[PDB]
Amino acid sequence: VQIGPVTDLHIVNADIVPDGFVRPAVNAGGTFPGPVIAGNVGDNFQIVTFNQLIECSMLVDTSIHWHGEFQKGTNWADGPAFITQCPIIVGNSFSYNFNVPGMAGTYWYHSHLTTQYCDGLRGPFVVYDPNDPDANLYDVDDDTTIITLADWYHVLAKEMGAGGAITADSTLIDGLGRTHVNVAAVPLSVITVEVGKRYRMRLVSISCDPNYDFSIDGHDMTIIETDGVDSQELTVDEIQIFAAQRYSFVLNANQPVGNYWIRANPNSGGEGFDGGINSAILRYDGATTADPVTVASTVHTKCLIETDLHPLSRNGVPGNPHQGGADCNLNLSLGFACGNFVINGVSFTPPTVPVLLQICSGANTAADLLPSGSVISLPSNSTIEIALPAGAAGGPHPFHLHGHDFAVSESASNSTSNYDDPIWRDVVSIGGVGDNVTIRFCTDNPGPWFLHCHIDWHLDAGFAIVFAEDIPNTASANPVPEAWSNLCPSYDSAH
Ligand SMILES: [O-][O-]
Ligand SMILES: [Cu+2]
Ligand SMILES: [Cu+2]
Numbered sequence: 328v329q330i331g332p333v334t335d336l337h338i339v340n341a342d343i344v345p346d347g348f349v350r351p352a353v354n355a356g357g358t359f360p361g362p363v364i365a366g367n368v369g370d371n372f373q374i375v376t377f378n379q380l381i382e383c384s385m386l387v388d389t390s391i392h393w394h395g396e397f398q399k400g401t402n403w404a405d406g407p408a409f410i411t412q413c414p415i416i417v418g419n420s421f422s423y424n425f426n427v428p429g430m431a432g433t434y435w436y437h438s439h440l441t442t443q444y445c446d447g448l449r450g451p452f453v454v455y456d457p458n459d460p461d462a463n464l465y466d467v468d469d470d471t472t473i474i475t476l477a478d479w480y481h482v483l484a485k486e487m488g489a490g491g492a493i494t495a496d497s498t499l500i501d502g503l504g505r506t507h508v509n510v511a512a513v514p515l516s517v518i519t520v521e522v523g524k525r526y527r528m529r530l531v532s533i534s535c536d537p538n539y540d541f542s543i544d545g546h547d548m549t550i551i552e553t554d555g556v557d558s559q560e561l562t563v564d565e566i567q568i569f570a571a572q573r574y575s576f577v578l579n580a581n582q583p584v585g586n587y588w589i590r591a592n593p594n595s596g597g598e599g600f601d602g603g604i605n606s607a608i609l610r611y612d613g614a615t616t617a618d619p620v621t622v623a624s625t626v627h628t629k630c631l632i633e634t635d636l637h638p639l640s641r642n643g644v645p646g647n648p649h650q651g652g653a654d655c656n657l658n659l660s661l662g663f664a665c666g667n668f669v670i671n672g673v674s675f676t677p678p679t680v681p682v683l684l685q686i687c688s689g690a691n692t693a694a695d696l697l698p699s700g701s702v703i704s705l706p707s708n709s710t711i712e713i714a715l716p717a718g719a720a721g722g723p724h725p726f727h728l729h730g731h732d733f734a735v736s737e738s739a740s741n742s743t744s745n746y747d748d749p750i751w752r753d754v755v756s757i758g759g760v761g762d763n764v765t766i767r768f769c770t771d772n773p774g775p776w777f778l779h780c781h782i783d784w785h786l787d788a789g790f791a792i793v794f795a796e797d798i799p800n801t802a803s804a805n806p807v808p809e810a811w812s813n814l815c816p817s818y819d820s821a822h
């Protein structure tokens with residue numbers, strides 16, 4: 328179902344059994360995944376979130392992030408708890424009111440309090456482009472062509488320990504999938520196609536942790552969009568998709584009428600496809616209603632390599648073509664030790680007063696801001712470079728920056744930088760030990776912006792820092808509504 332751009336979104340508790348195992352959940356809009364929030368580029372989004380949660384086992388507070396939306400001028404609407412807001416308390420509501428100038432494509436939204444998105448609060452967010460340059464490439468782009476991949480857990484998030492290796496208990500494709508252990512024959516999702524039609528498939532990782540090797544038996548996939556950024560056409564037969572990443576790909580329904588497995592193998596949890604785990608069904612209209620008996624290719628000959636992607640627009644790369652070729656160049660020390668992650672020696676632990684409120688209250692420098700050692704100020708209209716060398720305990724870590732997308736100057740498993748035409752995106756795998764994944768952006772968005780691993784279990788274990796972009800202009804750029812000012816008094820009184 329699609330709702331928006333002006334809509335109510337109620338947040339409730341509900342037991343669900345997507346793999347046949349009933350457990351509690353935290354739901355946005357009453358379903359899993361949450362309904363698709365949609366609009367056209369330049370639309371004003373007004374999302375009235377009603378917190379109706381009662382089950383403390385998963386926290387009755389909440390806060391929602393519109394993942395990959397820049398929120399320029401509306402840093403208050405961004406959603407990360409204790410960075411840009413206090414959580415909304417149960418029985419209250421809050422209006423996330425923002426615009427999406429300049430942006431189109433495939434996004435999602437999720438709880439950004441603690442590990443609550445794992446417990447169910449996650450759904451797709453699509454901004455349609457009435458003049459999409461990729462339009463002519465396909466016949467069908469709508470709610471039936473969105474594909475969510477989701478890790479599902481039988482253990483309540485709050486009780487995951489932590490960390491501590493944590494693994495999912497099944498993979499759900501469009502909200503349905505089978506358990507990894509003691510697999511019950513529960514309903515699988517179906518994606519239906521018509522012989523000779525081309526589909527814009529919107530592949531969305533709403534994962535709390537694993538990356539997926541995604542493929543469709545018998546079929547190619549032509550990537551045209553990556554994390555919101557239009558890409559040149561790239562035909563692959565497999566897609567490794569890390570947590571929070573998105574791809575639009577054209578699926579040409581050119582095979583014989585029949586049933587074909589859709590495969591999503593996670594990097595941890597259940598391996599393979601026995602009994603229909605890690606699976607959904609591509610069915611052609613006219614096929615018999617039965618399980619596919621198809622097989623994956625023994626070897627995928629054109630799997631996605633990030634370095635093969637290029638923006639469709641002439642994005643280029645800001646700054647100078649050598650490492651450090653930026654106004655403010657950073658090299659982050661990313662560590663793990665004794666169950667906690669650190670960025671430049673500091674494990675992130677959320678401050679009592681949100682970073683944005685701290686600034687609005689009169690803080691001027693990163694030194695003035697809590698948590699200590701967890702904030703790096705950036706000056707305005709400057710080219711930033713962030714090298715993010717891997718090595719820290721598994722891994723591979725998908726790093727995400729709020730309020731920005733970014734040129735991936737260097738990708739995983741490949742030590743050659745690209746300063747000409749690398750893909751831009753918002754979530755990037757930093758690869759493996761010895762890698763040096765490097766990103767670049769410009770500071771054109773004053774506000775405190777979260778940079779963290781999108782493995783949610785890693786975020787709760789402290790793998791995050793805040794880029795306090797243009798602290799001096801933050802208050803002026805982001806006027807807040809009274810309801811926002813009301814949040815922290817409410818939260819703090821209730822707790
Ligand atoms: O973005 O989490
Ligand atoms: Cu996110
Ligand atoms: Cu985000």
Ligand SMILES: [Cu+2]
Nearest residue numbers: 724780782785
């Ligand atoms: Cu991580």
Ligand SMILES: [Cu+2]
Nearest residue numbers: 392407729777
């Ligand atoms: Cu985030």
